[PDB]
Design a protein around this ligand. Structure first.
Ligand SMILES: O=P(O)(O)OC[C@H]1O[C@H](OP(=O)(O)OP(=O)(O)O)[C@H](O)[C@@H]1O
Ligand SMILES: O=P(O)(O)OC[C@H]1O[C@H](OP(=O)(O)OP(=O)(O)O)[C@H](O)[C@@H]1O
Ligand SMILES: O=P(O)(O)OC[C@H]1O[C@H](OP(=O)(O)OP(=O)(O)O)[C@H](O)[C@@H]1O
Ligand SMILES: O=P(O)(O)OC[C@H]1O[C@H](OP(=O)(O)OP(=O)(O)O)[C@H](O)[C@@H]1O
Ligand SMILES: O=P(O)(O)OC[C@H]1O[C@H](OP(=O)(O)OP(=O)(O)O)[C@H](O)[C@@H]1O
Ligand SMILES: O=P(O)(O)OC[C@H]1O[C@H](OP(=O)(O)OP(=O)(O)O)[C@H](O)[C@@H]1O
Ligand SMILES: [Mg+2]
Ligand SMILES: [Mg+2]
Ligand SMILES: [Mg+2]
Ligand SMILES: [Mg+2]
Ligand SMILES: [Mg+2]
Ligand SMILES: [Mg+2]
Ligand SMILES: [Mg+2]
Ligand SMILES: [Mg+2]
Ligand SMILES: [Mg+2]
Ligand SMILES: [Mg+2]
Ligand SMILES: [Mg+2]
Ligand SMILES: [Mg+2]
Lengths: 309, 309, 309, 309, 309, 309
């Protein structure tokens, strides 16, 4: 069985980068819409007995991309692929992970069920919003971390990183920032709202680094940056693995006081970078390519949790 | 257990009509989008131990409506509804029912699987494109027919209906037109392409009635009407249960020679009727309401196959 | 269908209380061990067509209790009970909810799968460690909150509760304490370690109230109380819904500086209260009885989230 | 894919022997208990793409061992092992194979379901109490027989084996003893109770050999030996594949009249042999190692049914 | 929901008797064959929301009857029956319950799986060949016993029944005969082959009663009767719940020395009674009717295990 | 059948509270007067096959409220409600329960007869003036007690309640005060007139608690309080379930020496509390809601006699 890399419509640049780092060409697939807005998927090459990897991120027009992904998975499954893996850098509906005193659907579980019934045997994703989403599946799920690439960017871009601070925008981000701080050996502050917020950890004359999993409307990071500047921090950085940047996000970032908003390219950012000069992008295509290659060859994937390939 | 009728965003008028004919109010549900194009569903009333019916048609923005439908089904299922029924007047992806020498997904089967895994116990639909789609499910599926309402419209709108002709636009429509002709006791012609088409059945000075399940781009009915006028038919009618009317459909119908294009309101048509004066709408909300009420009360549903309620 | 309440061996007092508040007698079941440590379960009364509720908490000898619970569920399922509900006040293996950079099993998902395959149709539990565990099941799960009873105890036991403070022992407890503070209209502090910990929120001359979901070894609450007394708080309270109290817990609580350690009786505490004079117990059997009765009668269960029955 | 052998806590000696006969080292796994009696399993080596075999016998603290086994299976399954096999020399709850006019659970079926849902693809077991338990699974089950090793022991340990007798302790043991007698070409007696028992088959001055699948409380074999000595048999032997030896078993065997109680090491017997001088152990680790190796290499496993490796 | 009783083609007399004892008419169903030997099933009445019971015995042309049964179950399931129960007085392939050192299918498990996937929610059967077959299903299975009717026949037909003997034809029949003997308070003999057989239990001048679950080729009962007459028993009786009577059975019974071969009407016997004057039939339709009625009304079914209705 | 709660004009606040505690909306009913003072009742929703509860208290303009109640009962009865229950917290004409040497009507019996002939199937009332009024009906009557709520108020409002006294204003109130005293374990005094009255029971320096069923003109409680202060009691309390407060009542209470006059909200008191600062109100809407819910669900209602819901 050989690796076949297929791209959805959501993130073609990421898929091309991944295929480049594997020494492959993207699989021949036509993904369009009929006139009635129905997804049309045609696999243009035989995938019989192959190790198929479909790259599709939960971004853009989310329901359309998810439908395309499910249809591609099912097409490869009934075309007798030996194994079908969904490479989903940003997991759709990941924030619908709990009910919490509401008659709300756990939409992430529904997405996991639909991926399972489409025929996915393996999920590769990056920085799941909640790790418990791994339990929503009955198939193996590899949850990669952008932390190696984030630390690399911090070291090569913040000259004052030995005295800097790693700040979480909310309580739920504590573990990630603590890990980052430990690997950098730096002090780590915290922030949480009460319309007011409290920041704990000395930041005066010290660079603050907000680290968080995603920014959708950028209310969280903007409030955090406001408070960080209240406490007299010199410069403020925001680092995110998923730059959804929806709605008022670009205006808020433009009107905010960040020195940089760094995001990983799990979501295409070219358009967002057009209208916001302070957005920078970390390439994580090497981590995804390495994970695909290691799952194919049966090598350890947890090695990546601590090493940049 | 009491009937609860919930509406999706796709066809709110149809749901309101159905709820009216059942003497009920639509269930309290909020269906919106987050900023990142993610479906948000909130059931505003307890459905515990109730007989929930969700009305949503595979029209408009199809993937968005299907995602909303699945999310609503799952929300009602994990909110402890006794039974959840998906009322899907136009089944999405119904035309993806077969592979036919292509590495194509059978998307209708995938939709059936997703409806099953969301937790639907019953499907009510109208004029499935292929009856074999009933076999795609492991739950009961009630496939209603618009034929009663169609015959009623023909009798009350075509004064020459005793001498008229019932014509199929393609080979695959033969059974429906034969049934219509038998119930009307009229001659039935046929049409099939060869860029040329052949029409069999005397139509000169006789009204032709094209009857078909759906019109998406209206190429089929337009070519059929062209040939019918070649054979000297006096007036031409098109009757359809699903008026998708996507892409060039409205321009084609406006430039065509139909005396009327009649569709059933399984899909909202107000906007299409705005730009096409020859589209008429048959109400089928009574058939849907009667089917919902008969499934709830355990009465025979196959009774509707031959009787207008 | 009538309510049948069955008790496991884990918490017989709680089951008797629940049956009392429902006006019922506990179902006739023999639960013993064979000589080879194998669970023997014998339902002594017909459950055919009944609404069976099995009360068993993930406490004591956990694997034995879980096996007994699964065996009872399966026995009632193949004895033709109409519906089987597992009332699990403390969910076993709930802390194994994620992998987090380790080749660790998500044991909570395995427990959910085993409960599903034994034949449980409904789960009633109290204060799940992670709400995402609700997504581990495909059946409905009712996750009750001890917050109503906790607020009642605080108001009737802490005369200074209008000026008091609600403190979380770790970051992951933020939401619960914020809800408690909002319903009491009090200031809410926070605590997190760095061997050192930082406390945010004025507590001098003010009573601190640690609120947390469980205490297993009581390291978390003991460190939190140490820091709270460092910041000069007058008296310190710990409130918990699950008092596992395993290992060095009783000695730590005896050597600690709590004014009271209050727990809810989701786990039997008679033995622990024998060796620790500062443990108090909140009865939550009324919430469980009300939830059982409301699920049986089809009434709203989410009503309990805000009201003491 | 390479063989990985993992040991549970139940029978570490058997697992070490099996790994020795395969030329392997036991896989690196930590299996302990948290303070609250919860099973903790940590796979210390990557099993990605490997052929994992977990050795765990339904002995000792049975529910704890079964939970450990299920947790290990699930851990290896979601760690992307190519195939997971449960090597279960003594199947837990095997005697709960039928209902038989009681509202009793078929606990063996529940255990099979839990093994399936944990993710086991293959079961290797020895001398199932009922062969129909193979039908409880939907995965392949290899049910090895200790008969080759038993015949070897009889021939090398009973000098009078050509004139001896093979006796069943109950009716349900008839097939096994008949097979043993046929392979030895000896007369076979039978025993069954009526507090009295009847023995059929001449045994005077002839050695009797009780052969049975398991001895739990040793009431069956002790009553059989009593009757055999009533009929004037010279010496009495008991041979068993599973020596559970629970409760009053050791005292009964010490007070009985056996010349030897021979058991196979599907269960650890060191402790039991400490307090009973007449217990002897047949090694069956070679049969288990050969079965593991033959399933891995795709060679015939049914070959072992008649040949000692 | 009301009881609907449907008959297959296998045993129409039994179904009519059952419907009579329930005060019902048999449901309107057409069960025929197309020209190509394909089963055609048409439910002639609505079963929507009803409690459907399909009576079909594993007799006659077994594969044809089983296919008809599965097709009827599926037809009633997708016709929206509330609950479908398969009343299978003689379970097909019940003797294929184990592998036993052969690459043989466990066909009984396959039949259980097919019944489950057709949509059966409940199985009612009589005297399963192995009780472990109840574990082959994941749905409830009621395994009725003919013992009440057998004891009634013995008491009303064998005037010497207080001094008689209850004999098992093989080892595997021990439990049934022991139960019969206990309820009659009589001595119980046993028989097993070695071409020779041994009988244990005094039978001289005493009537022997062979009791067994089924007679297929009647080799077992004929050899048992031969040995019983060797031991000087006065008269010999054979009692069976399933009279398959295939192949040389009728000639063997005619040439044998039975005073009577009594069978229960789980299989039609009119044709067999035509060519064998010593076959008598016990009606068990009352037990089946009582079980159907008690499962419908939610009353105890295990009551029948000891009482003739 | 579902619960329908309808409010009369007498006590709309109580009905809204009851509907809130049942999770319902008040039924749509228009209750007005024509110009000629005639009651107009229009049920605005179908009550066919429903469980109708009409809440109306014998207060305010009593004859008008009673006529409205009877008209509503009759309207729901001839609108085919399955069952109609009159929830009458204060029973009108309850004090006309006997003749007693006068040509007086037993008006309470007449009211019971009119309620029966209007079509009421069930009466729920609170603290009937005479229990024998239950015998005036031939339908079931549930006579709830305010004693649980009264004891709760006493314990949470009179800090000296362990040494207090429970005093009856007249002889006819003996049973109620004795029950209250027994549940509180306190001494109970008594009072009865001779223009003079005698008080029995030590009250010096002890709080006296007058407990009585109703206060109409408050002559009884005012004379009792006068005597209690004659005997040197420190503070005096009056507790009543029905605060009619007609005529000179408010002036008498204002000029009296009560520390508090506590009443239950069986009658609206907002207007009376406007002109009397010492009137406090106990909510009993939870008892009424619980009784309605328990009668609907068939649960025990006599449970409430001893427990606050
Ligand atoms: O839309 P934005 O203002 O950019 O906010 C996005 C936030 O949503 C998620 O947090 P969530 O609110 O789910 O809290 P949690 O991380 O504690 O679950 C995530 O951690 C981001 O902080
Ligand atoms: O987009 P339009 O030009 O309006 O055509 C829509 C056609 O699609 C379907 O037919 P299909 O081509 O699937 O053939 P079939 O009915 O024989 O399957 C349907 O019967 C319509 O005739
Ligand atoms: O054994 P103890 O010292 O009593 O600690 C028990 C802790 O375990 C859980 O927290 P966890 O460590 O899982 O963190 P989380 O709540 O943030 O997930 C729980 O919230 C308790 O605080
Ligand atoms: O606890 P002990 O006295 O050692 O008895 C253990 C017995 O249990 C099993 O027989 P079972 O009673 O299940 O009968 P069966 O073999 O006929 O099913 C097994 O065959 C042993 O003989
Ligand atoms: O075809 P016949 O000669 O009439 O034999 C039929 C026999 O088959 C079954 O026994 P089986 O051989 O399966 O043994 P068991 O009952 O011990 O399983 C059954 O108990 C009958 O005795
Ligand atoms: O109008 P008021 O001065 O407030 O009096 C109202 C009194 O009427 C009732 O007593 P009743 O006189 O009927 O005597 P009884 O309770 O002994 O029947 C009731 O018990 C009150 O005590
Ligand atoms: Mg969140
Ligand atoms: Mg967050
Ligand atoms: Mg087609
Ligand atoms: Mg067509
Ligand atoms: Mg945790
Ligand atoms: Mg915590
Ligand atoms: Mg047995
Ligand atoms: Mg045995
Ligand atoms: Mg057999
Ligand atoms: Mg047999
Ligand atoms: Mg009076
Ligand atoms: Mg009075």
């Amino acid at each position: 069985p050989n690796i076949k890399i297929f791209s959805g419509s959501s993130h073609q640049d990421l898929s091309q980068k991944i295929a480049d780092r594997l020494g492959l060409e993207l699989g021949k697939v036509v993904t369009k819409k009929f006139s009635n807005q129905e997804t049309c998927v045609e696999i243009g090459e035989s995938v019989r007995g192959e190790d198929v990897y479909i790259v599709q991120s939960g971004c853009g027009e989310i329901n359309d991309n998810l439908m395309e992904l499910l249809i591609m998975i099912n097409a490869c499954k009934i075309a007798s692929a030996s194994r079908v893996t969904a490479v989903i850098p940003c997991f759709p509906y990941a924030r619908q992970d709990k009910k919490d005193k509401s008659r709300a659907p756990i939409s992430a579980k529904l997405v996991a069920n639909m991926l399972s019934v489409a025929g996915a045997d393996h999920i590769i994703t990056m920085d799941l919003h909640a790790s418990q989403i791994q339990g929503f599946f009955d198939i193996p799920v590899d949850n990669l971390y952008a932390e190696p690439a984030v630390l690399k960017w911090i070291r090569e871009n913040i000259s004052e990183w030995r005295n800097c601070t790693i700040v979480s925008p909310d309580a739920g981000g504590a573990k990630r920032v603590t890990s980052i701080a430990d690997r950098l050996n730096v002090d780590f502050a915290l922030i949480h709202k009460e319309d007011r917020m409290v920041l704990v950890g000395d930041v005066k004359d010290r660079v603050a680094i907000l680290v968080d999993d995603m920014a959708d409307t950028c209310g969280t990071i903007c409030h955090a940056a406001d408070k960080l500047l209240s406490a007299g921090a010199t410069r403020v950085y925001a680092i995110l693995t998923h730059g959804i940047f929806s709605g008022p996000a670009i205006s808020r970032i433009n009107n905010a006081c960040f020195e940089a908003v760094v995001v990983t390219n799990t979501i295409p950012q070219e358009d967002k970078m057009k209208h916001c000069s302070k957005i920078q992008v970390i390439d994580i295509s090497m981590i995804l390519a390495e994970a695909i290659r290691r799952t194919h060859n049966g090598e350890s994937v947890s090695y990546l949790f601590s090493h940049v390939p």
